[PDB]
Amino acid sequence: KLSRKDYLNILESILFIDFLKGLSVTLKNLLRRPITTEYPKEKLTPP
Amino acid sequence: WGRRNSLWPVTIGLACCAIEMMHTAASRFDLDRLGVIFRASPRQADVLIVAGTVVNKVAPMLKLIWDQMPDPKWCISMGGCASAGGPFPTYSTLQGVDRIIPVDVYIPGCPPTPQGLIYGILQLQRKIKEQGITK
Amino acid sequence: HRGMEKLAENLHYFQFIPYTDRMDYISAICNELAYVETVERLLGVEVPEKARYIRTMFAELQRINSHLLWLGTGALDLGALTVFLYAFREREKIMDIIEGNAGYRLTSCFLRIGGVH
Ligand code: SF4
């Protein structure tokens, strides 16, 4: 008789590669100003 | 001012002065813009950076590391412990590394700040830059 | 070995505080708290409230700072130097707070017998 179909699976990409792409939201975004305080040019003043 | 003449030092971390050494190498101060390669094997190094206090038990071992370096070499004593024995006038502390190995630059501080260690290196470079400039 | 236990026999109690920083140089304020808390028991010295919270807070900032070093050097042991840079990025922040208040980056010498400096 009539029998519909399902398309789900062990297709973990619906939520796994989602977390792996989190690095593209943080590691790529980590290309901000260099934290480095160059010395002898531009000294850090002691408190 | 800025010289492509590279320096290959071996950092000898013995006490607290070594922790400040790591902070200078890290991303906060950039000790690369001065031409410091920082090789870890003493066989291929020319600057001995003694960062920490030298115990009498370590003195023979340290001297060996020095003689094992190529002759065009210099030595930096970071902190008072390696400079003059620092705050330890005791039965087991060697009062300054310059008593067993000639040192070219003394960096005062307990410990010196990363900038003080950098200024100390510039001083070693200042010396070399005009050590091969006179004769 | 530099003779810590023998140096104490020749110093006054308050004079030994800076030597406690140089025992576990990674967490100096913690060393001072242990020592000072002990001497304050011998001398029977009460510590005011403001100092008690300043001690507890700075002792914990040192624990974070000390674990970061163990984690950074622990990461450095297996390559992955990327963790070493991040760990020391955070250590530099803790040192900016400690240095601004105690006056020194590593050997703070912040505690005093009876409270804080
Ligand atoms: S000079 Fe000061 S900080 Fe450096 S090893 Fe000696 S006691 Fe420790």
B31 Cβ contact list (under 8 Å, min separation 6)? B24, B25, B38, B118, B121
β-sheet bridge partners, residue B78: B51, B107
φ/ψ region of B96 (left if φ > 0, alpha if ψ in -120 to 50, else beta) reads left
Report the run of H or E that residue A18 belongs to, with start and end.
Answer: helix A16-20
Residue B10 half-sphere exposure, CB side, CA atoms within 13 Å?
17
- SS3 annotation, B5-64: CCECEEEEECCHHHHHHHHHHCCCCCCCCCCECCCCCHHHCCEEEEECCCECCCHHHHHH
Tell me which DSSP letter residue C15 carries: G
Ligand 1 atom closest to the CA of C107, numbered from 1:
3
Q: Write out the E strands in C1-117.
A: 111-112, 115-116
Is the CB of residue B85 below 6 angstroms from any atom belonging to ligand 1? no
Shortest-distance Cα residue to atom 4 of ligand 1: B17
CA distance C28 to C26: 6
Contact B124, B74 (CB under 8 A): yes
| Dihedral angle sign, alpha carbons of residues B110, B114, B118, B121 | positive
- Of the candidates B61, B48, B60, B57, the one whose C-alpha atom is nearest the C-alpha of residue B102 is B48
Q: Maximum distance among all alpha carbons in chain B? A: 44
State how far the Cα of B75 lies from the Cα of B106, in Å rounded to an integer. Answer: 9
Nearest-10 crossing angle of helices C49-76, C81-102: 160
Ligand 1 contact via B87 beta carbon (within 6 Å): yes
Contact in structure between C53 and C83 (CB atoms under 8 Å): no
Q: Nearest by CB to A36, from B29, B113, B119: name it.
A: B29
Residue pair C1/C79 in contact by the 8 Å Cβ criterion: no
Residue B119 CA to residue C31 CA, distance in Å, equals 30
CA distance A46 to chain C (A): 8
**Chains near A, with 3+ CB pairs < 8 A?**
B, C
Q: Is residue B9 within 6 Å of ligand 1 at its C-beta?
A: no
CA-to-CA separations, B86 to B4, B23, B74, B115, C61, in angstroms, rounded: 34, 21, 21, 20, 28
Q: How far is the CA of C95 from the centre of ligand 1 (A)?
A: 17
Q: Which residues of B are annotated as a binding site for [4Fe-4S] cluster?
A: 16-17, 81, 110
**Ligand 1 close to Cβ of residue B122 (< 6 A):** no
Whose CA is closest to C106, among A10, B82, B114? B114
Give the 3-state secondary structure of residue C61.
helix
For residue A16, report the distance from its CA to the centre of ligand 1, in Å.
50
